[PDB]
């Protein structure tokens, strides 16, 4: 959890050393809404992720999309592939098209290449990421 040059912490969550009520450091979390269950690995985890939808400073609002994970080779973000049929009226026929969406995945989730994820829209996280994994399947 502390593999960075700076100390990782949830901002403004204070763990009082003088009191020492509980061994576990105080952990803030929220439920993201829209019927998405907050996983217990987020509630009882130790990870620090400012871009997590359950324990970071990001909210889910906007479009809710679904896709298939096609890449997981970068740290805490994946690439999903969304496929659709585009209609050509001249030939009165369809053609397969796709797009790649880069998504942020919180370390409360485990995703492999091939599984289906539901992602929710959040504020721009990076140059290309505007979505956050809210459910894996």
């Amino acid at each position: 959890v502390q593999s960075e040059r700076a100390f990782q912490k949830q901002p403004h969550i204070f763990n009082n050393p003088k009191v020492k009520t509980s061994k576990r450091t105080k952990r803030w979390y929220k439920n993201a809404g829209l019927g998405f269950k907050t996983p217990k690995t987020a509630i009882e985890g130790s990870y620090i992720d400012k871009k997590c939808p359950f324990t970071g400073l990001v909210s889910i609002r906007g479009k809710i999309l679904t896709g298939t994970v096609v890449s997981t080779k970068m740290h805490r973000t994946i690439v999903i592939r969304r496929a659709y049929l585009h209609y050509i009226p001249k030939y009165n026929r369809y053609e397969k098209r796709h797009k790649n969406v880069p998504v942020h995945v919180s370390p409360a989730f485990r995703v492999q290449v091939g599984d289906i994820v539901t992602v929710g829209q959040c504020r721009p996280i990076s140059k290309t990421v505007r979505f956050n994994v809210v459910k894996v399947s």
Partner: protein, 170 residues
Amino acid sequence: GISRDSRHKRSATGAKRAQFRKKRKFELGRQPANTKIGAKRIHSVRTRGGNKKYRALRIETGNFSWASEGISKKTRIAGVVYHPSNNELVRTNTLTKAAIVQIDATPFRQWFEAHYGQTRAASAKIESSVESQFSAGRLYACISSRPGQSGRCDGYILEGEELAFYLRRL
């Protein structure tokens, strides 16, 4: 000359984009204020709208908080000991947010002695590392303010796991 537009960058595919338009004032940046320890030098900046920012060009004091004791005292900043982004900021003693600095322990020591009557006993007990620092005369603190934005060099005294982490990193 600083701009924050994203049009000058390459597309996510790697394509080189062409110039859509000339640079706009609503997407500008300004020169950094490399705040340094010394006599207070602050100049205002007129920002978007009528709003104003404060540029700390130089600063040697700050309001630092002892969170366990729930207090704040104004204190002199001795120097920057560690910075997690760039070591040249430590080399040049540049004050920014998240910098680890050393502060004079005197006002906190005076408050502690006045409040607990000690140099009751259970409440007076504090961490061993913080007390060792008090013996040294300087306390490790983290700057929580943005000096180049608000003109203030506020911060707090390192304690617990954060203090252990930064003692290791030093």
